[PDB]
Ligand binder design. Structure first.
Ligand SMILES: O=C(Nc1cccc(C(F)(F)F)c1)NC1CCN(Cc2ccccc2)CC1
Length: 364
């Protein structure tokens, strides 16, 4: 019924794939800018602050125990309900219905795209452009659309949607995809088409003029939501580049400072810092790998980083578990210069309790 097999008569390119590119696709529950649990393409799950509530809503919708993770197809099914609702709203809108009806399927998708971005009221203010679309005056419509604040706000997306109105083709999307594919092919593993391996990751850093071992590259992996350090999947590369709005190394190079500035927000750094643990280990974290990554991410934040290094080098080798990783940031953020405000009854890991004692000689 909601079976995507019901849509197999359509084109492979569709409004879903369009918005997957223009708005992005998350396959795991995340919080939106307003802090609400969301999944797929901007599908609100609940306003409830409870993640379990979010997951129950998702299971109701998907029809299985999702654990808050869905497939792309499932995301499309959620999205398809959203689209149907949006289209019904278009059809209720005196200002949009005529244009919508007049349009072919590809251009409807462009219109639906505009409604998703800016809402019916937003789209309905494009009175002239809409009229031109209605009149099949595509070039004029295209020109007029480009004069707008919309275009200024999101030029990459807007130019794609406008190209869609202008041509009635998916050419903007096919072109973007092709460009990323040709880019990707520069880095893909010769023996596994669907990932970038060690050599490709080097080449990628080389093209970015980055030390493979620098924090910038970790920050990029974080933005690309990469799963693990040893490889870089096609999906991660494509979703990353699309999400960051980059179709070139040139463009991605430019984004890196912007990712750094994002890390100035403590919540965002927390996300990054905790991401790092997951990314670093093999599917706890090897102490040597932990130290390496700690030296990268805590440099300049953790006032006791050098001591921490010394402490861990003298301390008998042991795996680092997630909560130990996680809490070190809390420590680092909390702790006074002389550690005088340390709470030995704050349930810190034993490693951090140990560290505080070990650090007393340097403190004094
Ligand atoms: O970045 C790595 N893989 C990777 C995976 C997915 C996406 C991306 C990218 F960011 F490009 F999108 C990169 N592997 C590291 C690079 C540094 N060394 C040494 C190192 C350096 C510093 C601390 C610890 C280890 C380990 C392997």
């Amino acid at each position: 019924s909601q079976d995507l097999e019901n849509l197999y008569f359509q084109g492979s390119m569709n409004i879903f794939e369009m918005l997957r590119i223009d708005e992005g696709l998350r396959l795991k529950i995340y919080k939106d800018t307003e802090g609400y649990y969301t999944i797929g393409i901007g599908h609100l799950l609940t306003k409830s602050p409870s993640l379990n509530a979010a997951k129950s809503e998702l299971d109701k919708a998907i029809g299985r125990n999702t654990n808050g993770v869905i497939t792309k197809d499932e995301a499309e099914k959620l999205f398809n309900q959203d689209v149907d609702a949006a289209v019904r709203g278009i059809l209720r809108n005196a200002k949009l219905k005529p244009v919508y009806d007049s349009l072919d399927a590809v251009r409807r998708a462009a219109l639906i795209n505009m409604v998703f971005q800016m809402g019916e009221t937003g789209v309905a203010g494009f009175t002239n452009s809409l009229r031109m679309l209605q009149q099949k005056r595509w070039d004029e419509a295209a020109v007029n659309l480009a004069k707008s604040r919309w275009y200024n706000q999101t030029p990459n997306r807007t130019k794609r949607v406008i190209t869609t109105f202008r041509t009635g083709t998916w050419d903007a999307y096919k072109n973007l995809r092709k460009k990323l594919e040709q880019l990707y092919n520069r880095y893909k593993d010769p023996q596994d088409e669907n990932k970038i391996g060690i050599d490709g990751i080097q080449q990628f850093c080389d093209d970015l003029a980055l030390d493979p071992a620098s924090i910038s590259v970790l920050i990029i992996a974080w933005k690309f939501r990469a799963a693990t350090q040893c490889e870089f999947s096609k999906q991660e590369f494509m979703d990353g580049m699309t999400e960051l709005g980059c179709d070139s190394i040139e463009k991605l190079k430019a984004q890196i400072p912007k990712m750094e500035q994002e890390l100035k927000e403590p919540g965002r750094f927390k996300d990054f810092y905790q991401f790092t643990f997951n990314f670093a280990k093999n599917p706890g974290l090897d102490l040597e790998m932990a130290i390496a990554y700690w030296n990268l991410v805590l440099n300049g934040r953790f006032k006791f980083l050098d001591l921490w290094n010394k402490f861990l080098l003298e301390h008998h080798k042991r795996s680092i578990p997630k909560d130990t990783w996680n809490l070190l940031l809390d420590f680092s953020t909390m702790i006074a210069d002389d550690m005088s405000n340390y709470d030995e009854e704050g349930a810190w890991p034993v490693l951090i309790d140990d560290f505080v004692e070990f650090a007393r000689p340097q403190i004094a």
